[PDB]
């Protein structure tokens, strides 16, 4: 088995694998990830929750921070109106198999002790170090220090997130006494190859087939290919690609690796791959769609 | 006339027109924020006199004691800073000020207030402001201070607040007081309101004060901002003898023509300055 390997699987980067190994040995450890409540939960989200579940299976206590305060300022609904969406999100994640504690940013991000720390942090952060991570607003340089403060406040051992905010985690290590292990998940490529290019975990078998069919997917090309990415990150192996007895016949790959190879040497054509991943994804998301 | 009284000895009044309007209202308020200071010098006293004008002009006065700001700049714990602050209050009352005092820490970490700091930062640019992040935040906290205290007038020094006159519903009138030059002419170089007569005379003597030069002359600045006229300036009968100036403009005239020598000016400024500060020092 190995908990380290399970946590590491399908991650872009783990900022200090050696620290994680030390953290895994602790009798008590915790990890968190932030999400702005969202009406639709797509595969990007699901990818990350699967990671939290890996950590959950390794003995970590999970904390999901629901960024309602930020959602309020970005001008989404009212606090109580966002809470409804948040609780919905809570249902989805629970359906995904996550067992976590949920905290709404508004519960603590306006507290005096927390606000006082933002100002302290700001006195030690350069406008450069902060802008790092068409007309710039002040909020942009504040946001990353609030995030560092969240890491301090929630007391976690591990902070999880996409590869995008990987520089926001450089500040934490720089500005807080306790060093936290950062875990970064890959960023999924939009269905078109680049807002309607997402597959929702609760989309219908019809919609999924539809969204998949029109999807970007050059034969031979794997990098930046949304369909391949799905197969690498959600599909179970081995899996068999149903095939015309004349078109080459059934293919039985036992790993994403093999699949990748077949796709590169063009043994497997775009269409044949799409139908496989499509019906395959549909089964994998099925158990979640029901409880929703 | 109240508009003139308020304009008196000010660098600039951002929209006299707006001020003129404010004065019409039956109720109006103005504030200035100070970071508690161990020693109150002529600089502070100059601004308090301005607050006193507004006071006499019917403005309710608010003194914002910047303790939180002090605290964040490692200037000591808060309770210790309130001690210095409470003192400053006594000195401003001894100067004749009648206002309500408020410590920043009492509201600057409140939810409503902090939530308002985040809204403002979402509409302010990282340019129309600006090196540490805090630098670009203070200007937003200030606009928020003006908003929170709900003042019609904000007094301060020459230091981007009409920025507030843009992202705020109520327009505020800004007033910027001139900044004093040091005794040596460059910016432990200042007279304190509570200084002893003998110390004042000492500080005056060594001060930068070129015969005929008025620009940047601290002795002339003291003459223009605190002395009263007609001013009586004694002088040995062999140096022109005693002369009585009825306005600051005449003083400039005399001094600029070397008709008034630095020594004689100093003795008059020092002796008069002393007689003015006394009623205060005689209360602390």
UniProtKB/Swiss-Prot annotation, chain A:
Pfam families the record matches: tRNA-synt_1b (PF00579)
Keyword NADP among UniProt keywords: no
GO-annotated biological processes: tyrosyl-tRNA aminoacylation
Reactions the enzyme catalyzes: tRNA(Tyr) + L-tyrosine + ATP = L-tyrosyl-tRNA(Tyr) + AMP + diphosphate + H(+)
Binding locations of L-tyrosine: 32, 36, 165
Effect on the protein of changing residue 154 to P: Confers specificity for the non-natural amino acid O-methyl-tyrosine
Residue ranges of the region described as Interaction with t-RNA: 214-217, 269-274
Highest taxon above the source species: Archaea
Assigned EC number: 6.1.1.1
GO cellular component: cytoplasm
Site feature (Interaction with t-RNA) residues: 135
Keywords per UniProt: Aminoacyl-tRNA synthetase, ATP-binding, Cytoplasm, Ligase, Nucleotide-binding, Protein biosynthesis
Positions of short motif 'HIGH' region: 37-45
Ranges for region Tyrosine: 143-150
Places the protein is found: Cytoplasm
InterPro entries the record matches: aa-tRNA-synth_I_CS (IPR001412), aa-tRNA-synth_Ic (IPR002305), Rossmann-like_a/b/a_fold (IPR014729), Tyr-tRNA-ligase (IPR002307), Tyr-tRNA-ligase_3 (IPR023684), Tyr-tRNA-ligase_arc/euk-type (IPR023617), Tyr-tRNA_synthase (IPR050489)
Gene Ontology MF terms in the entry: ATP binding; tyrosine-tRNA ligase activity
Reported function: Catalyzes the attachment of tyrosine to tRNA(Tyr) in a two-step reaction: tyrosine is first activated by ATP to form Tyr-AMP and then transferred to the acceptor end of tRNA(Tyr).
Assembly and interaction partners: Homodimer.
Family label: Belongs to the class-I aminoacyl-tRNA synthetase family. TyrS type 3 subfamily.
Name of the molecule in the record: Tyrosine--tRNA ligase
């Amino acid at each position: 088995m190995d908990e380290f390997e399970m946590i590491k699987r399908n991650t872009s980067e783990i900022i200090s694998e050696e620290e994680l190994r030390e953290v895994l040995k602790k009798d008590e450890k915790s990890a968190y990830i932030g999400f702005e409540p969202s009406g639709k939960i797509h595969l990007g989200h699901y990818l990350q929750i699967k990671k939290m579940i890996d950590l959950q299976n390794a003995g970590f206590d999970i904390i999901i921070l629901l960024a309602d305060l930020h959602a309020y300022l970005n001008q989404k609904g009212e606090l109580d109106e966002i809470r409804k969406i948040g609780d919905y999100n809570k249902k989805v994640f629970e359906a995904m198999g996550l067992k976590a504690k949920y905290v709404y940013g508004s519960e603590f991000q306006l507290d005096k002790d927390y606000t006082l720390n933002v100002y302290r942090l700001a006195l030690k952060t350069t406008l450069k170090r902060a802008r790092r991570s068409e007309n710039p607003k002040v909020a942009e340089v504040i946001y990353p220090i609030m995030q560092v403060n969240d890491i301090h406040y929630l007391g976690v051992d591990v902070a999880v997130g996409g590869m995008e905010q990987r520089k926001i985690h450089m500040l934490a290590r720089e500005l807080l006494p306790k060093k936290v292990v950062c875990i970064h998940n890959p960023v999924l490529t939009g269905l078109d190859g680049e807002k309607g290019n997402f597959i929702a975990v609760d989309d219908s078998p019809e919609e999924i087939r539809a969204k998949i069919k029109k999807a970007y997917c050059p034969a031979g090309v794997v990098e930046g290919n949304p369909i391949m990415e799905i197969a690498k990150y959600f599909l179970e192996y081995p899996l068999t690609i149903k095939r015309p007895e004349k078109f080459g016949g059934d293919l039985t790959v036992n790993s994403y690796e093999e699949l990748e190879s077949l796709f590169k040497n063009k043994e497997l054509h775009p269409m044949d791959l799409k139908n496989a991943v499509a019906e395959e994804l549909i089964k994998i998301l099925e158990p979640i769609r029901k409880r929703l």
